[PDB]
Amino acid sequence: SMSVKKPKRDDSKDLALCSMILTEMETHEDAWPFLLPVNLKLVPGYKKVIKKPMDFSTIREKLSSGQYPNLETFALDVRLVFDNCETFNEDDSDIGRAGHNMRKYFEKKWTDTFK
Known part of the structure; x- marks a missing residue:
């Protein structure tokens, strides 16, 4: 509350460390469904169903331009990529499996770097 604060966690490396995670996600062999935005002109149903599209290149641009406050x-954007994937793709498909694999890969790096 006013004038009462928990000890200050050092967040000075967070930007660099998120960049590193994102590089690792970009270079994973199962990243291909997620590297670029889904083409809303060429994929029927995507635009109406997926209310907030997200992909690795859009997260990279946001990260590089100071659009993540913390x-x-x-x-939340990384998880959105995988939540969108699950919404649109059957679990028993190449893309559905890719999304589960990448979400696991992410969540481990996240815990190991920050928890």
Whole structure:
């Protein structure tokens, strides 16, 4: 509350460390469904169903231009990529499996770097 604060966690490396995670996600062999925005002209149903599209290149641009206020808003966009994937793709498909694999890969790096 006013004039009463928990000890200050050092967040000075968060930007660099999120960049590193994102580089690791970009270079994973199962990243291909997520590297670029889904083409809303060429994929029937996507635009109406997926209210907030997200992909790795859009997170990279947001990260590089100071559009994440803190490391949690960064994690929320990464998770959105996988939540969108699950919304639109059957679990038993190449893309559905890719999304589960990448979400696991992310959540481990996230815990190991920050928890």
